[PDB]
Design a protein around this ligand. Structure first.
Ligand code: NA
Ligand code: NA
Ligand code: NA
Lengths: 229, 236
C-alpha cells in the first residue's frame, strides 16, 4: 500500500523505530494512563473490552497497514477502555505518544490526510457492519466478515478463492451460535475445505447477505474490490 | 463548546455562511456525486441509507455542534450511500465542498484537530453502542439512548429528570437504539414504565431511576464520561 509505505518512511526518517509483538501480546492496554497512536504495519490484531464480570469482548479487527489510536488527538485521553491484542503469530508496529504525533502530523499534510482518512474508513466500516446486522442479523455479520477475508487474502484458483491465511489464524477470526453459522456455510458449500486449505466458492452468497460491507469495500478499497469482481 | 465556536468563526471569516434547513430536508443525499463536509452547528440530524426496496435504515444520529463528512478527505469520493436528514424543526449547518475543506484545514492545524477529534468520537460511539448491545441487547441499547438523552437534554423537575425535547417520537427513539419495528420497543418501554424507570406524562419523557440506565448502558455511559465529561458530570 503506497500511502502506507510513505507513512512508514515518514516515521523512520523522524527517528521512530518499529517494534515486534507476538500472539496474545497487548500493544496498548486499558490501564496505561499514557495513550498512544498505533501504526499497525504488519500482522492482525483485535480491539478488546472487559465487563464487570471480566468477560473479554472482541469489538474490532485490524490488519496492517492501518492506524489505531487509543486516545483523542486533542485531549490526549482514552477514547474507551480498550486493549489491542495480537492474534497473528507476529506483528510489526510503530508506537507513538499522541502528543508526539501531532507535531509530527503537522509538518506534512499528506500524512495527516492519510491518518485522517483511516479514521473515516473506520467510521463507515462500523456503520456498514451495523447496517448489515440490522437486516440479515448475525448471519449478515458472519457473511460480511467472510467477505472481508475473501477480498483481503483471497486468490482466484480453479478450486475457488483460496484464503491465503494460516488455518490457525483463520479459525480464530471466524459463541456457540457463531460456530453453527460458519459450519452451515461450510455445509452449503459456500466455503470449502480441500487439501489443507479453505476456498470460497459462492462469493455471490456473501455479497448478498453483507451488501453494505460489500459497498464499504467498493467505496474504500476499490482496487482490492475489483480483483474478485 | 469552545473549540466548536472557534471553528464557526474560522469558516465565516473564509466566506462560508450558515444555512437554514427545516425538518425532513436532506443536507446531503446518497445520489449526489458531489461530497460535502457538514458542520452541523445547531439542530438534530440522522444518517440514513435508503434501499431500492424503499426501506429506510437509521444508522447514526448527530446534534450540533458536530461534523459529518460524506466523502473521503483525500479521494473526495463517497464514504457510503448515506443521507443526512433533519429531524428537528429547524437546523443550522455550514455546507462545504470537500476540496474546499482541504484548503482550510491546511491553513489551520487547530481546527484540523477539531474535525479529526469528531471522527474519533464517531468510531468510539459506534463501538460503545455495539458493546452495550452485545452484553445487554435491545434493552441495553434503549437504556443507552435514554441515558444520553438524559445527560444532554436533562432538566430537573418534580416529576424526575424531564427530557426537554418536543415531538420526541417513540419511533425515532427506537431508530436510534438500532431497533427497527415498534413491537420490541413497545415491549421494552412497557417494562420500563412498570419498573418506574421512566414516565410518559406531559407528552414528554421523564427519567426517575438514572442508576438503572447506567446499570445496563455501562460502555455507553463510559463513552460519555470519556467523551463529554463536563456534560457527564451534570448527573453523576
Ligand atoms: Na490505553
Ligand atoms: Na474487475
Ligand atoms: Na452523497
Amino acid at each position: 500500500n503506497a500511502q502506507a509505505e510513505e507513512f512508514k518512511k515518514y516515521l523512520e526518517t523522524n527517528g521512530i523505530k518499529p517494534k515486534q509483538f507476538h500472539k496474545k501480546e497487548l500493544i496498548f492496554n486499558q490501564w496505561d494512563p499514557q495513550e498512544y497512536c498505533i501504526f499497525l504495519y504488519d500482522g492482525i490484531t483485535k480491539l478488546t473490552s472487559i465487563s464487570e464480570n471480566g468477560t473479554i469482548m472482541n469489538l474490532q479487527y485490524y490488519k496492517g497497514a492501518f492506524v489505531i489510536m487509543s486516545g483523542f488527538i486533542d485531549t490526549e485521553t482514552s477514547v474507551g477502555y480498550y486493549n489491542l491484542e495480537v492474534i497473528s503469530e507476529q506483528a510489526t508496529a510503530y508506537v507513538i505518544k499522541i502528543n508526539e504525533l501531532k507535531e509530527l502530523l503537522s509538518k506534512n499534510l499528506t500524512h495527516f490526510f492519510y491518518v485522517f482518512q483511516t479514521l473515516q474508513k473506520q467510521v463507515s466500516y462500523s456503520l456498514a457492519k451495523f447496517n448489515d446486522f440490522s437486516i440479515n442479523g448475525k448471519h449478515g455479520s458472519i457473511c460480511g466478515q467472510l467477505l472481508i477475508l475473501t477480498y483481503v487474502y483471497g486468490k482466484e484458483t480453479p478450486d475457488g478463492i483460496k484464503i491465503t491465511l494460516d488455518n490457525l489464524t483463520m479459525q480464530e477470526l471466524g459463541s456457540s451460535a457463531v460456530s453453527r453459522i460458519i459450519s452451515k456455510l461450510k455445509q452449503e458449500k459456500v466455503i470449502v475445505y480441500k487439501n489443507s486449505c479453505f476456498y470460497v466458492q459462492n462469493l455471490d452468497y456473501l455479497k448478498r447477505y453483507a451488501p453494505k460491507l460489500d459497498e464499504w469495500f467498493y467505496l474504500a478499497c476499490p482496487a482490492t474490490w475489483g480483483k474478485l469482481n
